[PDB]
């Protein structure tokens, strides 16, 4: 359990005093829960962490109850940004961040859009930030925005793949963190400009 806090994701904007409906379970956007994701929905998840079986736009997607297209942060293109995750129950696993470089609030984000910009960690270590220790609190991740990419209505997607289930690793082996895991996604509305 945790949420993208800086910039604030859609279901957490109430915490900062925005006029968006509150979600007191904003730490629980776990794709409808593990069994719903993996037993009901074939491993699929909404773009923004909702149960995949809900119709689009889902509650945390643009046009859903929490998706009012209110920009919560403005960044310079190509800059290093520092994002904060509030981790309430610190399940082992890793985080990834994707940018849908959308320019119109009336079109809907898709995973294909997000997948065009998988964000690199500023430290050069790749695309996955690993939370190695079970410690609740605020985790900061420094990310490099892609050079030359600007967007007036961007969506930032945080993905958390937990690692607390044992499964077939596919190499003849099984292991902790192999196979399907509980997953979280959160979306935040941001803008990126040359400035
Ligand atoms: Cu949790």
Numbering used by the authors: 1 to 195
Q: What do the authors say?
A:
Here, we report the investigation into the digestive enzymes from T. domestica, which we show include members of an uncharacterized family of endogenous LPMOs. Phylogenetic analysis reveals that this family is widespread across Phyla not previously known to possess LPMOs, including algae, oomycetes, and complex animals, and is active on both cellulose and chitin. The high statistical significance of the new HMM, and the lack of significant hits against HMMs of previously characterized LPMO families, allow us to rigorously define a new family, which will appear as AA15 in the CAZy database. Our in depth phylogenetic, structural, and biochemical characterization strongly suggest that AA15 LPMOs are a key part of this ancestral mechanism and help explain why T. domestica is one of the most efficient cellulose degraders in the animal world.
The coding sequence representing one of the most abundant T. domestica LPMOs (contig GASN01405718.1, henceforth termed TdAA15A) was cloned and expressed in Escherichia coli with a C-terminal strep-tag. Samples were analyzed by MALDI-TOF MS and peak masses of the reaction products compared to previously published data, revealing a predominant C1-oxidation pattern and generation of C1-aldonic acids on both substrates in presence of an external electron donor. MALDI-TOF MS analysis of crude extract from activity assays carried out with Cu-loaded TdAA15A in the presence of 10 mM EDTA failed to detect the release of both native and oxidized oligosaccharides, indicating that the apo-enzyme is not active and that copper is essential for activity. We determined the crystal structure of TdAA15A to 1.1 Å resolution, revealing the typical central β-sandwich fold of LPMOs, decorated with diverse loops and stabilized by five disulfide bonds. The Dali server was used to compare the fold more widely with other structures in the Protein Data Bank (PDB)19 revealing that TdAA15A most closely resembles bacterial AA10 LPMOs with the best structural match being the Serratia marcescens AA10, CBP212, 20. The TdAA15A active site is also characterized by the ubiquitous LPMO histidine brace. His1 and His91 directly coordinate the essential copper cofactor with a T-shaped geometry as observed for all copper bound LPMOs characterized to date. While having most of the canonical features found in other LMPOs, the AA15 structure reveals an unusual β-tongue-like protrusion which links strands 8 and 9 and forms part of the surface surrounding the active site.
